[PDB]
């Protein structure tokens, strides 16, 4: 009997004032929340933000919407949301958000007989996350999502995670290319501004960076270029064109890798660990070229000393490079 | 009682003309401003602008909204803002702005018993900032936000910073990697257009650019290449091939560094200080090559004169380079 349902819904929305919160003038209305994380698409060090898609569900009680004589939850067309009160929830650290709207607005309104309202949205949000890159690429970051009431103070509304630590689901399924999610945490607190105290929910993730990409991207290329630079010591000293070609090509490849590295990062004013490693590699290749310059300089009158210097550099440079790698990987691990 | 407040608000909005300002036809209405800065996302020289996010709060008195019998301040659902008069405040130097709308429009309306309205918005705006880059990268910028009334002249409306020096908060939340905030300033004034006089608030920041590693990353390579070009003075003049090779290599390397560097920096169209520095270094290396050309020209008939000219170049060139560096760093610092 759809006519009775229609009459009941018309009666519930008769004289209903959306300008007033539930229990206006009385105790604060308690709003529970939960989130299903569908995906975390892209994490950007350049922009210091991450993108996240989620199903965001809010639960509250509105005694003006209690109905009798129908033993069912009433899932209603989402346009009824424009005729009801909803919480004024927002995200502090977001930079640009939107609700999906294909094929219609991705919104859900479900009434329960006792007056409980379930209000669901599907949201894609970009959120700010300041990153500490002092230990890059061996770093660990903490990215948060802050959820707050905009207009209502703690005397009108209260937030709580509905279900405790089970209120956020789908984190273990998330796959990120450069990162892995070590842990996620849920916090509830109050925040005081000049206009009063407001409830605050925080959802934080701790991300540990995978090293394999950096091994494949900067570490292995640097090692291979350094070995190529060491190939010069085994060519006879009178082949000037070959060894100068080797030196110039290795230096240029070092510069290209370094420029790519610094391109993929923000313009921070301090020295990073990877910067230290890259300038170590540059020092090594420059020293190899200077060694060749010296040998070519002194070899006309002392061929034996030049041969001895080249032969000893054949051993000394790999050993010192190994020591530098040891020191670097021991200071950061 | 919720019905009593409902009918009180219905009586407040009954007979309310949204087309008329408070005290229309009488003394001007005073509007107090407040800004709570959340972040400055980015500062762009190429686009000559910056992105700012803020809570913008407006305070005024509308006698038509006064109510009695309720010793409380009514925090209303923000949709009621579509039924009230609000000031037509705009930002003169903004280029693209939006109000955040997730989960709802980030808007706040608070009424007080005597008729005071507090109206809050969360706004992200990309505002223009004409930067003078003549001293770049050692430059200091001044970026402003201009707040004005569009339609109402000084006869209708007045602006003032609410709280004086404390009207703008959150300046310590501004975290720019490439800049630091030195000072902020608040200004109130009037602006005359052909349609009358309008109130104008102004919020300005002074940005100081951070030098560190990146300043060195450019200026040092040219100096080092110039010194390598000075290495030619100590090599005997019988080595025509070696010295000619040194001069050509240093010159061509200077040209390559300059071209790649300009291909790297932002594409400002005008000439910067660093361009003048690089051109000075180019002039020095070209003069060193010309000096060698002269030495090669005269040394076969006047070797003693050639040796004296080389010895004096040995002394003069480092001295003139030091003078050039001294003058440059005195003028630009």
């Amino acid at each position, epitope marked *: 009997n759809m006519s009775f349902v229609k009459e009941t819904v018309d009666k519930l929305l008769k004289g209903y004032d959306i300008r007033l919160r539930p229990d206006f003038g009385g105790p604060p209305v308690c709003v529970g929340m939960n989130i299903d994380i569908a995906s975390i698409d892209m994490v950007s060090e350049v922009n210091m933000d991450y993108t996240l898609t989620m199903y965001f569900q809010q639960y509250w009680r509105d005694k003006r919407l209690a109905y009798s004589g129908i033993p069912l939850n009433l899932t209603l067309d989402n346009r009824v949301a424009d005729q009801l009160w909803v919480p004024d929830t927002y995200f*502090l*650290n977001d930079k640009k958000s939107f609700v999906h709207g294909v094929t219609v607005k991705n919104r859900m309104i479900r009434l329960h007989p006792d007056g409980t309202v379930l209000y669901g949205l599907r949201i894609t949000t970009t959120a700010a996350c*300041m990153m*500490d890159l002092r230990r890059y690429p061996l770093d660990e970051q*903490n990215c*948060t999502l*802050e959820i707050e009431s905009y207009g209502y103070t703690t005397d009108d509304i209260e937030f709580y995670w509905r279900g405790g630590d089970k209120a956020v689901t789908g984190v273990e399924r998330i796959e990120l290319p450069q990162f892995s999610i070590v842990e996620h945490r849920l916090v509830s607190r*109050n*925040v*005081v*501004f*000049a206009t009063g*105290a407001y409830p605050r929910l925080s959802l934080s993730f701790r991300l540990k960076r995978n090293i394999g990409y950096f091994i494949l991207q900067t570490y292995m290329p640097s090692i291979l270029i350094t070995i190529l630079s060491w190939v010069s010591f085994w060519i006879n000293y009178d082949a000037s064109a070959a060894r100068v070609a080797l030196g110039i090509t290795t230096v240029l490849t070092m510069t290209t890798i370094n420029t790519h590295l610094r391109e993929t990062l923000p313009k921070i004013p301090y020295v990073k660990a990877i910067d230290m490693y890259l300038m170590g590699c540059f020092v090594f290749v420059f020293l190899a070229l200077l060694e060749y310059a010296f040998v070519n300089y002194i070899f006309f009158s002392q061929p034996a000393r030049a041969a001895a210097i080249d032969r000893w550099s054949r051993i000394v440079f790999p050993f010192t490079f190994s020591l530098f790698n040891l020191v670097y990987w021991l200071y950061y691990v | 009682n919720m019905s009593f407040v409902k009918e009180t608000v219905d009586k407040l909005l009954k007979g309310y003309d949204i087309r008329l300002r408070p005290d229309f036809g009488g003394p001007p209405v005073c509007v107090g401003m407040n800004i709570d800065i959340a972040s400055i996302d980015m500062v762009s020289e190429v686009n000559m602008d910056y992105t700012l996010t803020m809570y913008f709060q407006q305070y005024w008195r509308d006698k038509r909204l006064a109510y009695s019998g309720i010793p409380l301040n009514l925090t209303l659902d923000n949709r009621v803002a579509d039924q009230l008069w609000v000031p037509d405040t705009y930002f003169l130097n903004d280029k693209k702005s939006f109000v955040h709308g997730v989960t709802v429009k980030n808007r706040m309306i608070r009424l007080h018993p005597d008729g005071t309205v507090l109206y809050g918005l969360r706004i992200t705006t990309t505002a223009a900032c004409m930067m003078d880059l003549r001293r770049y990268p050692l430059d200091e910028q001044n970026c402003t936000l201009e707040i004005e009334s569009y339609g109402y002249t000084t006869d209708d409306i007045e602006f003032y910073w609410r709280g004086g020096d404390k009207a703008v*908060t959150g*300046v*310590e939340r*501004i*975290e720019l990697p490439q800049f*630091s*905030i030195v000072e902020h300033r608040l200004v109130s004034r009037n602006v005359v257009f052909a349609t009358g006089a309008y109130p104008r608030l102004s919020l300005s920041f002074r940005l100081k650019r951070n030098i560190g590693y990146f300043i060195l990353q450019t200026y040092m390579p040219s100096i080092l290449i110039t010194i390598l070009s000075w290495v030619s003075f100590w090599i005997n003049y019988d080595a025509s091939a070696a010295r000619v090779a040194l001069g050509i290599t240093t010159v061509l390397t200077m040209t390559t560094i300059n071209t790649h560097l300009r291909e790297t920096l932002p594409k400002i169209p005008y000439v910067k200080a660093i361009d003048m520095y690089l051109m000075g270094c180019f002039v020095f290396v070209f003069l060193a090559l010309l000096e060698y050309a002269f030495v090669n020209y005269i040394f076969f008939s006047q070797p003693a004169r050639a040796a004296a000219i080389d010895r004096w170049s040995r002394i003069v060139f480092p001295f003139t380079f030091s003078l050039f560096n001294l003058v440059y760093w005195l003028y630009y610092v």
Partner: nanobody
Amino acid sequence: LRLSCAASGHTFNYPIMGWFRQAPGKEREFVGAISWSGGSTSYADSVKDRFTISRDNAKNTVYLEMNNLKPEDTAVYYCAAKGRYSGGLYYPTNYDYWGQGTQVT
């Protein structure tokens, strides 16, 4: 006189340090705040032009130099850390990690 607050651990997640003082009969009162990186100080009215705050990241320390003292400056002093999105700068509730109390007469 000069008070030093040295912080260790996750100083990146708490980029702001603040100073408070507690009177024998009154609640905690904000004195000043300093940013770890920006070095942008903020002061209460009662200690403007008199107290100064400086920061050094070498050993993660913040110094409060007190000059031109007065007998109305006899309160137990505390140092605290504030989160990145913790709200207003003048409210003790928004500060998580509090140091040990220090007495001044």
